[PDB]
Each structure stands twice: as C-alpha cells, then as structure tokens.
Design a protein around this ligand. Sequence first.
Ligand SMILES: CCCCC[C@@](C)(O)/C=C/[C@H]1C(=O)C[C@H](O)[C@@H]1C/C=C\CCCC(=O)O
Ligand code: NA
Length: 437
Amino acid sequence: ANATLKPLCPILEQMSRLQSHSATSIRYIDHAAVLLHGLASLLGLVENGVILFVVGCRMRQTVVTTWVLHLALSDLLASASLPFFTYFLAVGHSWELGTTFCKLHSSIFFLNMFASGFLLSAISLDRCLQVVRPVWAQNHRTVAAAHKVCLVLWALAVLNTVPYFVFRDTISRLDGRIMCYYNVLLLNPGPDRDATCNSRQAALAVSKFLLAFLVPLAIIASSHAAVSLRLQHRADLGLQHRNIFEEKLFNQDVDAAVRGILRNAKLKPVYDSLDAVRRAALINMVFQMGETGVAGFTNSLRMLQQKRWDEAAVNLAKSRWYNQTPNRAKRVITTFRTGTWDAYRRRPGRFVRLVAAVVAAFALCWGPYHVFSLLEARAHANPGLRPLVWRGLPFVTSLAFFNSVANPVLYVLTCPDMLRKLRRSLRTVLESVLVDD
Ligand SMILES: CCCCC[C@@](C)(O)/C=C/[C@H]1C(=O)C[C@H](O)[C@@H]1C/C=C\CCCC(=O)O
Ligand code: NA
C-alpha cells in the first residue's frame, strides 16, 4: 500500500494484471447479479429465521430437531455474510471494506462449509446407531448429548477455518479494484515461492474437499447402506414366529449389569421383587446412571419393592435424572407403572425425507464449488486452466451460498409437521387483529 511491496503467486499476480475493459479505471456493474444476491440475502435471513423459531419454540425438542436447528444456524450465518458479497458486486467487483473484514466475511463462508458437512455426517451416524444399536440408543440418545455433539463439531469447524482467516489478504488490481482472495505467501514463504504457492494452494483445496465433502458423503452413504441391510434383516425375522416380546462400543451386555445389580445390597431385593418386565427397566437405569446412581434413590426403590408404582413415579419425576433427560427417564418410569413394554414402542423413523433432501442439496451445491477449487490448485502448473477458473469459480461460489436459501424450503416441503406448526403460528399472528381489537 504505502510504498510497500508484497510477493504474490503467479495466479494472483495474473489476476491482478487482468485488464477488465481497457485500462481505464471504469467499473462495469452487473446489476442483474446484485439484485439476485441481494434478494437472496433477504430470503436467506428471513427463511432461516422463521425455521429457527418454529423448530426452536413451537416444536417438541428431540435429538433430530437439534441437528436441524444447528444446520439452520449455519445457513443463517451464511445468509448474514451474503449482504457484504452483494456490495462487492454493486461496487463493480472490488473489496472496499478494509483488510480485517475481508478475513471475517470469508471465514463465515468457510465456517458454514465445514459445519454443514460435519452435521450431516452426525445426522447420518445418528440414524445409523438408531437402527443398529437400539438398546444403547434408547438409553443414551438424549437431546443433552445431541447439543454437546453440535458444540464439538462447531469447534472443529471453527478450527479448520483458521487457516483461511490467516491467508485472506487484500490484493490491489490495476483496475483500481481491490481483491479479497488467498495470499499463500502472506506469511513464512518458502525459499522456492513457486513451490510454496503450488504446495499451500493445493493443500487447502484438498483438505477442504476431504473434510467438508468427500468424508461426509462417504459417512452418509456408508450409514445408509448399513441401516438398509439391517431393516432387510429385521423384516425377515418378524415374518417368522419370533415375536415373544423380546464393554464394546455401543454395548448391550445385560448379564454384566445383573451381576452388579445382585452384588449391590440396595438393588438385590428390588431386582428380586420385580416381574420380568420391570427388571429390564431397572437394568436400563443402571446403563444410564450406573448402579452407584440408581442406588442413590433410597426412597424410590422402597416403593418399587413394595409394588407402590404410582407413588414411585412421582418421586422419579422430581429427580434431576428426569429433569435433564426426561424422554429416556419417562420411558423407564412408565415401564415401572404399567409393567408392560409398550413405552419402548420403536415405531418407524421420521425426517427421512428431510435428511434425504438436505443431503442431495448439499451434494449439488457444494460439489461444483470443490471441482473448480481443485482445478485452481492444478492451474498453477497448467496455466491453460487459469482463465476457466477465473470466470467459472465465482459462479460455483454463489451456488454454495444459495444452498442456505434452499435448505429452509426443503425442511418445510418434506415435513408436514414443519409446515403445519408454521401455519398455526402464522395465523395467530394474523388472528389477534380480528378478535376484540
Ligand atoms: C469466501 C467466498 C465469498 C467471499 C467473496 C469475496 C468478497 O472474497 C470476493 C472474492 C473474489 C476475489 O477477490 C477475486 C475472485 O474473483 C473471487 C471470486 C471467486 C471465488 C470466491 C472465493 C472461493 C475460495 O476461497 O476458494
Ligand atoms: Na448448511
């Protein structure tokens, strides 16, 4: 800037010397694109806003809803960076908002990329453990954990975007335009700049393609294949006369706990004074909070041994165990009350249409982006690709942004419960005016 020089890579040094029009500082404005992205910015913000409200405040909080919630939060952040990308187009393709903002704005785009990929993998593996490890799932699939998993994924997402925040720099074009783009040589360049430019620009493109696209889709496909075969296998068994009403990761070792239950003085008589059905609900508690924890329930165990079911339930509903993970505790409590196994219904899964649509959208929108970015890495050696990447790369990036505008629509189209609770709240907002204004 102020009598400072910086070494640039051939790709950017050429993008800098690219003469738009004829060396005259006059900027052409594609008014069509500006309105498109600007409208997109509006839609994306409003759409993911209402989705966060419906799922968040007007919907029964489950584990699956927790994935959709974070997935729409990322799309909201993308929708929030999109306005600044429209200004970049209105100015005439130039970054006029200092250097430090060129990093944050860009990182936001990459943050939603890693986050969306990680969450979709989590949704897949969740659906897989739901089918392949039913016993372990009904004792540990709690919305509390789902929330904790999302935070770890966000931290991992914020971590893989750190490199992109660092190497984002503002490069001045000859047009008077200011670019906001990679600056591989911004810090500790190598004695062989041609190597560092090729090396780093290729490492970023591949790691991004693996962690944020290839691996997610691999996990997604693998998970889908595993559940598909298990359901094929479960259907075969059901059509046989095997309906009598019946440690390693994601375990299911019943014999192990029964030997610890009988080894505990407080639990042995309660486990002996129980029918077959209520003995299983007691083992489920041990799986969830251990024998040391279930033994803490001094007054409530007394009720179970004495067949005082309804009275025991009141006590458990007052416990922290019920007030932190109610769904799994309600399952165990009611099982003691009724003495049947209906609470563990295990009816078919929901949100299959939703998860399928979002995965398809994720694949089509981010697929093209990663294709051109890798060509960019290969275009260092092969200059013939550079002009194709120059013009073709900005279009695939706008595609990725529009994914955050389509996901909210896919949510509603493929889930009646979603559209239904949106209308009811949309009517309450249009029904207070009518009655006794
Ligand atoms: C982070 C994406 C949203 C930010 C957009 C913005 C303001 O950085 C403007 C960028 C443009 C330039 O500065 C030159 C170049 O034409 C570039 C447009 C083409 C692709 C976008 C980057 C893709 C990647 O990082 O792999
Ligand atoms: Na997303």
